[PDB]
Amino acid sequence: GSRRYDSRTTIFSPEGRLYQVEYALESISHAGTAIGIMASDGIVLAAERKVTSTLLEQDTSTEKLYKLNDKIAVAVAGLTADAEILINTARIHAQNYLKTYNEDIPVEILVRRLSDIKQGYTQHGGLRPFGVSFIYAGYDDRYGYQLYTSNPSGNYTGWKAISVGANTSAAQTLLQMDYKDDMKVDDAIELALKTLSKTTDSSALTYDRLEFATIRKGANDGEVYQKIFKPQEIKDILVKTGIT
Amino acid sequence: QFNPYGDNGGTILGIAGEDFAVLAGDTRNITDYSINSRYEPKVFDCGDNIVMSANGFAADGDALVKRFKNSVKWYHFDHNDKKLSINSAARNIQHLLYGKRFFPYYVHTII
Amino acid sequence: MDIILGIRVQDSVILASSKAVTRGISVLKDSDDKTRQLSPHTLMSFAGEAGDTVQFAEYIQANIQLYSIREDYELSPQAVSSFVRQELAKSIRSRRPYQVNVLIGGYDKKKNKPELYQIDYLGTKVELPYGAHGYSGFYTFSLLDHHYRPDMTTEEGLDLLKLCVQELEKRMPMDFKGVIVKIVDKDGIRQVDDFQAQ
Amino acid sequence: GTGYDLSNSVFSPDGRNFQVEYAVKAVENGTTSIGIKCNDGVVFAVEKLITSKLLVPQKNVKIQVVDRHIGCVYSGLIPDGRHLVNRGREEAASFKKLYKTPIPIPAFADRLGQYVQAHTLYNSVRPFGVSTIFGGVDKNGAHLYMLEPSGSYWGYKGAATGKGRQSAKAELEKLVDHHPEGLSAREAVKQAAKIIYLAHEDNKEKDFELEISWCSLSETNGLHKFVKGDLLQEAIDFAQKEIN
Amino acid sequence: DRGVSTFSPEGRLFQVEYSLEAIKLGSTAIGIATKEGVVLGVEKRATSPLLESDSIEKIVEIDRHIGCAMSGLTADARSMIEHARTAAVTHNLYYDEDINVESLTQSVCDLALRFGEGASGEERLMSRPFGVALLIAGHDADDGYQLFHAEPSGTFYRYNAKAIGSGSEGAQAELLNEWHSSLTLKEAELLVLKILKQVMEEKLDENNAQLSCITKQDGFKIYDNEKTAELIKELKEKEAAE
Amino acid sequence: FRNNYDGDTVTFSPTGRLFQVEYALEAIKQGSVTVGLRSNTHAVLVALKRNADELSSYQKKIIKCDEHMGLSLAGLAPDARVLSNYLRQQCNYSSLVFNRKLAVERAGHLLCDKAQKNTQSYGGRPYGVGLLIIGYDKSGAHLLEFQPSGNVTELYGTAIGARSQGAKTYLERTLDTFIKIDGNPDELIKAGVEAISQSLRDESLTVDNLSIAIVGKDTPFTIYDGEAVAKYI
Amino acid sequence: MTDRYSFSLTTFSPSGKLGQIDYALTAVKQGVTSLGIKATNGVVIATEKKSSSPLAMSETLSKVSLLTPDIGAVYSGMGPDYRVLVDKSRKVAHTSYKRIYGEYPPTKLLVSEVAKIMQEATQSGGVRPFGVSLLIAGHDEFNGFSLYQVDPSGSYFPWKATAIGKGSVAAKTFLEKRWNDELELEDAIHIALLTLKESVEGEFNGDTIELAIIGDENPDLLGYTGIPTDKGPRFRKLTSQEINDRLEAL
Amino acid sequence: AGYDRHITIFSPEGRLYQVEYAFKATNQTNINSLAVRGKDCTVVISQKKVPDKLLDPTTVSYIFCISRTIGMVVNGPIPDARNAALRAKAEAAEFRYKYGYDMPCDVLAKRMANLSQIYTQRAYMRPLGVILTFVSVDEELGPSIYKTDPAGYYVGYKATATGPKQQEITTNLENHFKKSKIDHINEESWEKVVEFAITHMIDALGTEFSKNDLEVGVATKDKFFTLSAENIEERLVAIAEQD
Amino acid sequence: GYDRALSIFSPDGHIFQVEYALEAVKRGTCAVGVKGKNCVVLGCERRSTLKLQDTRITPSKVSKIDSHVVLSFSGLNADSRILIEKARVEAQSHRLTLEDPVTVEYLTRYVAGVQQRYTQSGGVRPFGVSTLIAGFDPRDDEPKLYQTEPSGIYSSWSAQTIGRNSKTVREFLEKNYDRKEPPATVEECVKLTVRSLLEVVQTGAKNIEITVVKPDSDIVALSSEEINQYVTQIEQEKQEQ
């Protein structure tokens, strides 16, 4: 029969752990580091591009920062292709919500739905889980700025500052060291770059190896704006923050 | 257009005595103004001391009586040859008929 | 059809709905409350096809209460009305459509303003100062067009409705057996037990 | 490595399908049966081992008819044989229903062929545990066929399978040489009864019952019929006589 | 691995046999059938003193004339009870009468072998056999009082008395010597109470054990604690009497 | 060896064997003995009912499939229920649609085919029960032996179950004798009981332990248990 | 029957590797070299026609395929896998885009579609990942020219120039030396020919080499006239002759 | 782990053993075949070997008439060959019904190759242990030979050979074309092309053939047919009067 | 399509997947519940493997299934969500058809059923979760506390705990909870609860959350201070000796 070749991707270990989830997490741990920092006036998403070449087109590239809504975005750590599958369904769920209630979807509701999808691949179906971890940066009129994280297990949590991917241990310790509740978006942007800068497995931290995004409520307006920095924009902020 | 129903005439009568009961019926089967048969039994012995007749549209009457007899057979198979009481047959027949509530057996049945 | 009326004043929404339930030749009940509370600050009145009417109302009520529990939050009146419109807009193209018309009166605690939504069985939604379904609008809209003011007090709104009901009781052929009136404001939903002679 | 013989549709390093080969073993372990093509028909005969006196004689018929002009006999797992005939019957009814004319032997052979071959395509099914000799008369002649568990089949002059296939094949080859002009239905029936008696030596331990059937344009009108009474006994004798 | 409906070289279904092992680990349950009714008793066996014993329901009603006791993975018995209650009620709706105890039992046993990953016979969607055995007891006009033992194998046996669960080999031996064709309902009660006491790890009292019966006159009844406590006392006295 | 080829029915062993089927056949051997024999007017089934405890009942081993057909089982009772129920329907179908009683030979063919499907596909399992079918149809009295392998055979008599070999040798000897017990049921039955006792060892056939069934010329398939079999002990 | 393989054939190992993706990539490594170079006014993709026999007709086998009139693809790895990926790509360009918006999809989106098809063969039940890496070149009004690589995992990335397969490491290095952001299409073609020469063992000519470009519109390749807005495909496969002419200026 | 050799999933080397072993199966029949293109015809030769004396020689063939115009010769076990033939005939018929014209040889080839590619990717389907050589005189392409294997690969050939001694035939043919400098047999009659085919078959295999040792198929404008033992004998006689 | 029997019997009569499901529960943060004379209190401990969380938004351990019933758990968080959603849906359905909210036992029997079902259905693993469900039946003032586990088994408790070190805290409760005189006060009940958690939480003002459920949908969660105050008064009881 077929049973012979079934890996059984959804069983418990004698210790009560989920093999595939643990292995997927192990996979994620080798992915480019992504960081999320929540400030009083905004949110920052920063990510290190794993592997790069002189010939890689960076102007037309995006492998870690994706817009889900006009008020929600995510940073990806893991299999890009798996991420895109989830990203797309997330984009649809947001629209369904909007059409149903004529209100943008609350950040947690969208995060919970995506995590629930992940949880599924964990309990039934016999399929491998998605080798992906997300850092969600969004805003809604009930909780304002929010920062979430979800991993292969389908579990999610809220943060003031957090990281996913490689060297999270080191990154977390550094963030837990310099983060302060009254921080400002600009302070946060600097903290993010500094943190990545000290955790990079690479020589130096150049602009061609970074993706940056911020969700701020531009004072001169009254609405929420998402800014996915352009190569030159990252290059700029890199010099200013004193990393040249 | 096609009419799934027909009328074969006939009249049946059931009278319950104190310790007996009779179920009678003429033996004439018709179609419009023609006689199909002067002798076509319409009242049947269904076992377990139960007699039944489903009058009206003969094709429907036959189907029903046939389905009921088969019900008695399986009642025995499924309940250690227990005898099907007349009241139990009656309830059973109700379900047989109601099963076709939206495409009825065009008959007036009496047991 | 039954009388379904609604008016949005300064700080509340008022819904008036006939109490009679007529089946054929007889008036079976004269104390029918054609309303369902969808949430502490949202009320929905309805009129239409015999069984569909309550089945729809209770179905919507169940869904809103479920959302409230899941999110530990109360959806805005506008959000609730869009959900209801979509449900009706689906139904209209289904095997057997819900023949139900509704008025949704809610007090938005975030905006601190009352809101009245009119939605027919086709999923046709509109927001208004006052509205109705059926023939009700035919007898009352000329009165509302005249005496309505955005700054009316709840008491003024009740007086205007009373006038509307009187016109209905004079010119309408059917005896709808009066109306049950309910107020929806910042403090919730309450019923005016005294309109039989206010 | 190994284990190539545990699942049905698996190719071994030498390109074989071991499960099909093991099926063949079940076939060789079965009663011997044969088929002889004559000048205007075909004859089928089989060995029926009499396990005990308790077996009602002549009752457990093994030869089966398909449509009205085809005979089928087989060696191996009897149930598998019936299964294959039931299919052949649906296959024949389908063909007649659509084309009006009864199914030609070649066409029929392939219907059985594709079905048997089908059971060597997946590991969710087991190959057929029988070799089947079948045939009949059609629009242009008589036809004899033998079908292996692999789905392989060819047209034959004579054919045999089961315990004593070698003896039978040997005898059949003689006939072929000593009768280039063609045997007659009448003769084939006797010849067949003999071949079976002879081939019974490879199982001379248990007593047996002979069964023959034929389909001759002149003897049966092109319809398949069982050899009974006088014609049967006459053939029994012809064999019993030449066995000494 | 190996199919869940595979035969052992001895001609047994592994899953069914392993199922019987789980049943051995369950709490004890005993049934005694007399011409005056059938008694059904069970060992509550709470796992902690903080557990409210009365919430342990190992004896349930199927219909007014049928009750049943379970032993083993008790959670697996909920759908069995549900199917049973539905079969009995359904039978009544279709025939305006009570379903025979044996019929009810056969229906429950029909679920038994409906397990597998795609067994060619119908649509047996259930990954494994039930891990609980049941004692079905009741009364009907054709065969009077009856006690049946329904196993995850699908077979069911009628017994005059029967014990299932951890202390079954022992308790059954006892029942063998204690049962006779003229036992009274009261004798049966005391008898069930006594055997439970012998095989139970804990000292039997009205909180860790429960009795019930079914009589033609009053149907299936679960004895409240007060009622059983007295029967306990009555047993202690008759034993100390010799 | 075996261990690598007996995991499921869809696998042939290197010698061309189907172990799962053989293991199923083993469940029959572990089953209580039952006998079947017929003359030209009747067919009889004699079965030894087995009990669990002395507080338990002796499980029924004879099932009626129609007024002219029935069988005895040896092995997994549930499987007998499934197969006999299929036979009840087939008989029933024959009556309702063609107003024809189903030929015992045809019933044998249908059973063979039903059992075969569970020996060539993944996921299922072979039936683990043996059956002896008797019946009186348009060609007289009949007795059939059904094996889970799908092999069905017509005989004058036979036996299956534990120690069945005793009764079988007895019948193979008594053949010329009982085959002529026409017009006398009691004689055929006694002959059957004599064959079955040829497989005893443990105890002796008692009243609530013996089970008999007969069908014939003017006899609708009927079962005798207890008091009704006393006149044969 | 019935595919009973409803579970994944690609799962995570303790180290976190996805075995089958890895193995698929290894199959790609053994494949013939193929490359793509983006110029300021076009893109070129090329590979070697490794004829498996001189009796074979290398023209009847195209390693460079047109997906849309402005997008082409080439690969390295398992040819049969590529062939079906191309059928699916051409079709998805229609079903998921042209039949909706009345226009062909932009390069990145079609690439995104292909990538999805590949990602699914990495997680769906009963299948193995595709044993290929594609290089897709195209042009669209709002993005201009672009070049993408799609791997067995479904991942894709934009390139200025790159190579895949057998001698990809060396070839990528040679490309890094010759590439600049002021290259004209002819220059890219020339660089492409040079890079491919290092990878070819035997004959090197227009019959053993397969090359196509994404450049200006070819109104002569439209097939009709009358619609001012329809100017022709930007995709064009070079002819054996066109290649040799450029090989002399090698 | 070691099961990467039972189903069609990649091995650590990125190989598909099952597809490789399926290739092994193609030589199981120990038969060799070859195809050449004429000026306006296509010929396919294939050894015919009937060992058993009890077989009806007329029913032993590895050449099939797929459509009025397409011919196909198979190298591999007959049951898998007949599976391919049935499918090819059905595909050929359906194509005509849906698209209004006869399915081209190369298109049928691609179609069958794609089907093969799938058994290569889906675990529940095993590859067929055969190599299919399709021939015809396409209305657009002229004489055509397209061959497919268990890997799902296919391509057009000027001429080709398949079987155990495939290599010897191939090099023989290669040499001839290196000499002639053209990609077909410049002969106007298919009879002579068939003769060329057999001649080189003999040279390369170093064997003589009787009329029952061969099997021949010819494709011409609007028709594909196989020769009879006698049509063949006439062919053998002609080549004899040259050597 | 996937229907592999993941939960099956082993030779000794065990179902390892259900057994390992329990092991996941032992690994979860501790949860406790104790019923007073007129209330029920639910306590949960807060892990500290990582601290820098946003408590406002991070999902809480106690969930309301309806206005009169709550559910807490120990085990896989992602798994608990599935059970909670189904429970909430079933609560509304019950109100819609029976025109009365669910009793606590009914809601419990429902969740347990879902759990049992996932132990004998093909293609799915059991829930790595155990739950404590508490509240008051409609129009009833008698407190209710139930517990469910992966197998699908459930029962009511005077007090119970689940999760890591639940062994420890259960002992505390077994020799600190008198059925004769249950915490006759919301206060003394919450205290006994905090005390039992302190036996394992090891000084965790922000690592201990409590929720108080009273009759008629009166449910409220305490704030750090309110709890922290209980802790303080408790550490003194010790030192004052």
Side-chain angles (χ1 to χ4, degrees), chain E residues 3 15 19 29-30 39 85 89 154 188 230:
Chain E
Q15 283 305 107
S19 177
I30 299 170
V39 175
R85 289 169 165 169
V89 174
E230 304 181 14

mmCIF file with all atom_site columns, all heavy atoms in Angstrom, chain E residues 3 15 19 29-30 39 85 89 154 188 230:
data_model
loop_
_atom_site.group_PDB
_atom_site.id
_atom_site.type_symbol
_atom_site.label_atom_id
_atom_site.label_alt_id
_atom_site.label_comp_id
_atom_site.label_asym_id
_atom_site.label_entity_id
_atom_site.label_seq_id
_atom_site.pdbx_PDB_ins_code
_atom_site.Cartn_x
_atom_site.Cartn_y
_atom_site.Cartn_z
_atom_site.occupancy
_atom_site.B_iso_or_equiv
_atom_site.pdbx_formal_charge
_atom_site.auth_seq_id
_atom_site.auth_comp_id
_atom_site.auth_asym_id
_atom_site.auth_atom_id
_atom_site.pdbx_PDB_model_num
ATOM 1  N N   . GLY E 1 3   ? -1.656  -2.220  8.639  1.00 0.00 ? 3   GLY E N   1
ATOM 2  C CA  . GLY E 1 3   ? -3.066  -1.864  8.611  1.00 0.00 ? 3   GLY E CA  1
ATOM 3  C C   . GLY E 1 3   ? -3.785  -2.049  9.936  1.00 0.00 ? 3   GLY E C   1
ATOM 4  O O   . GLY E 1 3   ? -3.426  -2.926  10.725 1.00 0.00 ? 3   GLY E O   1
ATOM 5  N N   . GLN E 1 15  ? -5.885  -4.907  16.289 1.00 0.00 ? 15  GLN E N   1
ATOM 6  C CA  . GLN E 1 15  ? -6.561  -3.787  16.921 1.00 0.00 ? 15  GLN E CA  1
ATOM 7  C C   . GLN E 1 15  ? -7.658  -4.203  17.889 1.00 0.00 ? 15  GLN E C   1
ATOM 8  O O   . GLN E 1 15  ? -7.822  -3.587  18.944 1.00 0.00 ? 15  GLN E O   1
ATOM 9  C CB  . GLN E 1 15  ? -7.134  -2.848  15.860 1.00 0.00 ? 15  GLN E CB  1
ATOM 10 C CG  . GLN E 1 15  ? -6.091  -1.960  15.209 1.00 0.00 ? 15  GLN E CG  1
ATOM 11 C CD  . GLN E 1 15  ? -5.301  -1.168  16.234 1.00 0.00 ? 15  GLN E CD  1
ATOM 12 O OE1 . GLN E 1 15  ? -4.135  -1.460  16.487 1.00 0.00 ? 15  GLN E OE1 1
ATOM 13 N NE2 . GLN E 1 15  ? -5.937  -0.166  16.840 1.00 0.00 ? 15  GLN E NE2 1
ATOM 14 N N   . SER E 1 19  ? -7.452  -3.806  21.885 1.00 0.00 ? 19  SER E N   1
ATOM 15 C CA  . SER E 1 19  ? -8.572  -3.058  22.429 1.00 0.00 ? 19  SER E CA  1
ATOM 16 C C   . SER E 1 19  ? -9.007  -3.720  23.734 1.00 0.00 ? 19  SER E C   1
ATOM 17 O O   . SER E 1 19  ? -9.267  -3.047  24.734 1.00 0.00 ? 19  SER E O   1
ATOM 18 C CB  . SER E 1 19  ? -9.729  -3.063  21.429 1.00 0.00 ? 19  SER E CB  1
ATOM 19 O OG  . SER E 1 19  ? -10.855 -2.402  21.967 1.00 0.00 ? 19  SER E OG  1
ATOM 20 N N   . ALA E 1 29  ? -17.184 -3.520  36.435 1.00 0.00 ? 29  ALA E N   1
ATOM 21 C CA  . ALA E 1 29  ? -18.621 -3.385  36.216 1.00 0.00 ? 29  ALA E CA  1
ATOM 22 C C   . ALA E 1 29  ? -19.207 -4.795  36.278 1.00 0.00 ? 29  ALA E C   1
ATOM 23 O O   . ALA E 1 29  ? -18.672 -5.722  35.668 1.00 0.00 ? 29  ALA E O   1
ATOM 24 C CB  . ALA E 1 29  ? -18.895 -2.751  34.851 1.00 0.00 ? 29  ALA E CB  1
ATOM 25 N N   . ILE E 1 30  ? -20.304 -4.953  37.013 1.00 0.00 ? 30  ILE E N   1
ATOM 26 C CA  . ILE E 1 30  ? -20.941 -6.262  37.177 1.00 0.00 ? 30  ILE E CA  1
ATOM 27 C C   . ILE E 1 30  ? -22.442 -6.225  36.906 1.00 0.00 ? 30  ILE E C   1
ATOM 28 O O   . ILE E 1 30  ? -23.129 -5.262  37.258 1.00 0.00 ? 30  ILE E O   1
ATOM 29 C CB  . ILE E 1 30  ? -20.739 -6.801  38.623 1.00 0.00 ? 30  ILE E CB  1
ATOM 30 C CG1 . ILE E 1 30  ? -19.242 -6.961  38.923 1.00 0.00 ? 30  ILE E CG1 1
ATOM 31 C CG2 . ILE E 1 30  ? -21.494 -8.118  38.803 1.00 0.00 ? 30  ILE E CG2 1
ATOM 32 C CD1 . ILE E 1 30  ? -18.931 -7.255  40.388 1.00 0.00 ? 30  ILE E CD1 1
ATOM 33 N N   . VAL E 1 39  ? -29.638 -6.360  37.909 1.00 0.00 ? 39  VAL E N   1
ATOM 34 C CA  . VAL E 1 39  ? -28.875 -5.372  38.663 1.00 0.00 ? 39  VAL E CA  1
ATOM 35 C C   . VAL E 1 39  ? -27.597 -5.092  37.898 1.00 0.00 ? 39  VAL E C   1
ATOM 36 O O   . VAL E 1 39  ? -27.008 -5.994  37.299 1.00 0.00 ? 39  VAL E O   1
ATOM 37 C CB  . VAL E 1 39  ? -28.487 -5.876  40.082 1.00 0.00 ? 39  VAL E CB  1
ATOM 38 C CG1 . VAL E 1 39  ? -27.596 -4.844  40.775 1.00 0.00 ? 39  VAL E CG1 1
ATOM 39 C CG2 . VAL E 1 39  ? -29.741 -6.132  40.914 1.00 0.00 ? 39  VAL E CG2 1
ATOM 40 N N   . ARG E 1 85  ? -29.571 5.048   22.155 1.00 0.00 ? 85  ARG E N   1
ATOM 41 C CA  . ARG E 1 85  ? -30.770 5.803   22.488 1.00 0.00 ? 85  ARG E CA  1
ATOM 42 C C   . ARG E 1 85  ? -31.568 6.140   21.231 1.00 0.00 ? 85  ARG E C   1
ATOM 43 O O   . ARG E 1 85  ? -32.804 6.135   21.240 1.00 0.00 ? 85  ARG E O   1
ATOM 44 C CB  . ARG E 1 85  ? -30.382 7.085   23.225 1.00 0.00 ? 85  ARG E CB  1
ATOM 45 C CG  . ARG E 1 85  ? -29.862 6.842   24.631 1.00 0.00 ? 85  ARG E CG  1
ATOM 46 C CD  . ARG E 1 85  ? -29.227 8.086   25.233 1.00 0.00 ? 85  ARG E CD  1
ATOM 47 N NE  . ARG E 1 85  ? -29.072 7.936   26.677 1.00 0.00 ? 85  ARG E NE  1
ATOM 48 C CZ  . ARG E 1 85  ? -28.370 8.753   27.456 1.00 0.00 ? 85  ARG E CZ  1
ATOM 49 N NH1 . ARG E 1 85  ? -27.734 9.798   26.938 1.00 0.00 ? 85  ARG E NH1 1
ATOM 50 N NH2 . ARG E 1 85  ? -28.324 8.532   28.763 1.00 0.00 ? 85  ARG E NH2 1
ATOM 51 N N   . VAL E 1 89  ? -35.340 4.816   20.388 1.00 0.00 ? 89  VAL E N   1
ATOM 52 C CA  . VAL E 1 89  ? -36.386 5.801   20.136 1.00 0.00 ? 89  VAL E CA  1
ATOM 53 C C   . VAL E 1 89  ? -36.895 5.659   18.699 1.00 0.00 ? 89  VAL E C   1
ATOM 54 O O   . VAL E 1 89  ? -38.108 5.680   18.465 1.00 0.00 ? 89  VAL E O   1
ATOM 55 C CB  . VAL E 1 89  ? -35.874 7.250   20.363 1.00 0.00 ? 89  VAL E CB  1
ATOM 56 C CG1 . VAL E 1 89  ? -36.933 8.258   19.945 1.00 0.00 ? 89  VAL E CG1 1
ATOM 57 C CG2 . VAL E 1 89  ? -35.527 7.448   21.827 1.00 0.00 ? 89  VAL E CG2 1
ATOM 58 N N   . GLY E 1 154 ? -17.514 -6.856  18.165 1.00 0.00 ? 154 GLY E N   1
ATOM 59 C CA  . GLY E 1 154 ? -18.769 -6.901  17.451 1.00 0.00 ? 154 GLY E CA  1
ATOM 60 C C   . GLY E 1 154 ? -19.632 -8.040  17.953 1.00 0.00 ? 154 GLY E C   1
ATOM 61 O O   . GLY E 1 154 ? -20.830 -8.075  17.677 1.00 0.00 ? 154 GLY E O   1
ATOM 62 N N   . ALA E 1 188 ? -29.396 -10.322 44.500 1.00 0.00 ? 188 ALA E N   1
ATOM 63 C CA  . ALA E 1 188 ? -28.528 -9.879  43.419 1.00 0.00 ? 188 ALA E CA  1
ATOM 64 C C   . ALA E 1 188 ? -27.797 -8.590  43.811 1.00 0.00 ? 188 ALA E C   1
ATOM 65 O O   . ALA E 1 188 ? -26.583 -8.474  43.634 1.00 0.00 ? 188 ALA E O   1
ATOM 66 C CB  . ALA E 1 188 ? -29.349 -9.660  42.160 1.00 0.00 ? 188 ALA E CB  1
ATOM 67 N N   . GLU E 1 230 ? -27.453 2.043   52.594 1.00 0.00 ? 230 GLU E N   1
ATOM 68 C CA  . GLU E 1 230 ? -28.183 1.102   53.437 1.00 0.00 ? 230 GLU E CA  1
ATOM 69 C C   . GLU E 1 230 ? -27.915 -0.336  53.005 1.00 0.00 ? 230 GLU E C   1
ATOM 70 O O   . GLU E 1 230 ? -27.751 -1.227  53.841 1.00 0.00 ? 230 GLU E O   1
ATOM 71 C CB  . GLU E 1 230 ? -29.686 1.369   53.367 1.00 0.00 ? 230 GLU E CB  1
ATOM 72 C CG  . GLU E 1 230 ? -30.086 2.780   53.735 1.00 0.00 ? 230 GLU E CG  1
ATOM 73 C CD  . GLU E 1 230 ? -31.592 2.970   53.681 1.00 0.00 ? 230 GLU E CD  1
ATOM 74 O OE1 . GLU E 1 230 ? -32.319 1.947   53.618 1.00 0.00 ? 230 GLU E OE1 1
ATOM 75 O OE2 . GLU E 1 230 ? -32.051 4.136   53.704 1.00 0.00 ? 230 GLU E OE2 1
#
